[PDB]
């Protein structure tokens with residue numbers, strides 16, 4: 001049974017020989033540096049008395065994915081002040097109040113809250129909902145807009161039912177229960193598949209949707225088995241519903257193993273840790289660690305999912321190392337302890353491209369310390 005059933009979370013750092021005091025201080029220091037560090041390290045910026053944003057340093061914008069990541073980090077670290085500031089920013093500037101995207105979030109804005117595009121990013125919505133449910137379960141609902149579980153159910157209502165009552169499209173395809181890349185297009189992004197979050201939506205969402213969420217959890221586990229290469233464990237950034245790489249798009253070639261796809265190994269490993277349902281997740285984790293076992297972080301490239309390297313380097317090599325190390329939650333092969341130590345010995349990334357690397361790094365620091373947990377509807 002998983003950590004959801006047992007309440008016991010694997011501490012991979014402790015299993016590797018790091019001291020409990022050492023591990024707690026390292027996680028606290030990662031939080032301090034990421035949220036409140038120097039101008040070359042931090043990715044969180046408070047705004048006035050009641051707002052704050054996660055900055056995509058590389059693109060000079062604020063992204064729904066980043067805001068939702070920050071909320072998950074804050075609720076996992078018991079940081080309600082930062083949680084509330086981030087949520088108020090997303091609620092105030094990004095959430096649509098009308099039209100085809102009502103209750104969805106404009107996927108990016110300028111730091112000052114000016115929307116740059118109206119379209120939403122489903123990976124943002126699902127993290128907002130999961131972080132808000134955990135906020136409700138840890139702290140209790142406050143007055144709107146800090147009525148966390150009510151806000152979460154509103155987001156997930158739109159995710160399944162948008163355009164039943166006028167203009168818009170859902171973020172899940174009703175026929176296959178798979179999350180989409182964007183509401184309008186008939187293909188997916190493997191990194192967006194969070195079956196472990198859908199298991200929990202099946203407990204917390206509007207009652208009429210709980211069967212759908214349970215089905216989505218199983219459909220996403222099956223989908224990832226079709227999307228990850230059976231030899232390398234590599235997945236494409238964009239994939240068809242059948243798991244094969246999607247066609248080249250106007251805005252780029254997403255057929256290869258690059259930034260988005262790094263999260264798949266981390267998502268697979270956390271579902272295994274929480275729920276322990278699909279033993280394939282152990283083999284997927286072993287395969288990707290085997291692929292990268294003798295590749296130094298300094299040599300990380302773009303790869304075809306068949307494992308053929310490009311000259312082109314990885315944009316976010318620290319992020320890739322982070323996700324390869326988080327796969328140690330499920331891997332039982334000869335590389336698992338090596339990746340945990342490689343990760344421990346890697347500092348937070350600095351400079352203009354740091355944001356994505358450091359979000360993945362933080363989730364890995366949470367998970368490998370046994371601090372990436374389910375906050376259940378439970379007794380005092």
Ligand SMILES: OC[C@@H]1O[C@@H](O[C@H]2[C@H](O[C@@H]3CO[C@@H](O[C@@H]4CO[C@@H](O)[C@H](O)[C@H]4O)[C@H](O)[C@H]3O)OC[C@@H](O)[C@@H]2O)[C@H](O)[C@H]1O
Nearest residue numbers: 056058063065107119120121123124182251259260355356
């Ligand atoms: O500017 C990049 C953008 O990709 C397409 O964006 C989608 C949009 O997806 C979000 C894209 O950003 C993802 O996260 C990035 C991963 O790579 C990192 O280098 C970067 O720092 C991260 O921000 C995020 O996960 C997605 O939610 O979703 C809405 C779509 O309308 C939009 O098309 C844009 O075409 C391309 O410019």
